Design an enzyme around this catalytic site. Structure first.
Site: not given
Lengths: 245, 12
Positions: A46, A96, A195, A197
């Protein structure tokens, strides 16, 4: 990271800081990642899906600060940006997971040092019991309402939550799948946030520090009944092995 | 857009 503590790269030496160059020269922070082999950083799809061009990206290893250099750091271009073809989203991102093959201007990969080291992958379908304490690391927001990211790296501790607890309607319902892991603080007082991620969820499994998860999604941050959600790395080993081979 | 999942997105 909401709550938790400041740290430096020595305490998470697989941590990769990933930035994107904009049309015009501007460089902004994108996401975290984890060094799993000298040439390979693992992160979340993502983070990249809207800008899939590899040439846009800069990866640092051995970096403890967001917008200043850390002594001993290494800078890399992205030789290949590999996104998971079964990625999907409506908030709760499926599959993801992303791989970045890194290569310096001199054509080289990571060189292990006091500040640059790899993290072990788990055994397939081998995760810690729920209630286990694990750590998360990143440059994400310290408060949901903040505009800025912290300049210094942070880490915190969160506890793993059962699929049964997380799939309750008052948690996340069917947004959470068996390929995901929930983790949260018992008081909901510390968590990953915007942030963070792509960064590591690390658990000690049989005495070995193991990349159990990758920061993926959540509704807000440090909110009651809304855990952080992580890609369950132990369910993606064939994907990782095939795409790094 | 102000939390995890929509980092580096063109909508945000």
């Amino acid at each position: 990271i909401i709550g938790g503590e400041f740290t430096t790269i020595e305490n998470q030496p697989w941590f990769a800081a990933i930035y994107r160059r904009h049309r015009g020269g501007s460089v902004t922070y994108v996401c975290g990642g984890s060094l799993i082999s000298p040439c390979w950083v693992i992160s979340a799809t993502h983070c990249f899906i809207d800008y899939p061009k590899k040439e846009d990206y800069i990866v640092y290893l051995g970096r403890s600060r967001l917008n200043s250099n850390t002594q001993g750091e290494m800078k890399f271009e992205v030789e290949n940006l590999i996104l998971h073809k079964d990625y999907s989203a409506d908030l709760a991102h499926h599959n993801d997971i992303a791989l970045l093959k890194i290569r310096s201007k001199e054509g080289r990969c990571a060189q292990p040092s006091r500040t640059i080291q790899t993290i072990a992958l788990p055994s397939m379908y081998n995760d810690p019991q729920f209630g286990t304490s694990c750590e998360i690391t990143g440059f994400g927001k310290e408060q949901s309402t903040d505009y800025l990211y912290p300049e210094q790296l942070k880490m915190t501790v969160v506890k793993l939550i059962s699929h049964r607890e997380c799939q309750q309607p008052h948690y996340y319902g069917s947004e959470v799948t068996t390929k995901m892991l929930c983790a949260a603080d018992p008081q909901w007082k510390t968590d990953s946030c915007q942030g963070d991620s792509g960064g590591p969820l690390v658990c000690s499994l049989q005495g070995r520090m193991t990349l159990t998860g990758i920061v993926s999604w959540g509704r807000g941050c440090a909110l009651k009944d809304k855990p952080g959600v992580y890609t369950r790395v132990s369910h993606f080993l064939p994907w990782i092995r095939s795409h790094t081979k | 857009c102000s939390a995890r999942g929509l980092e580096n997105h063109r909508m945000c």
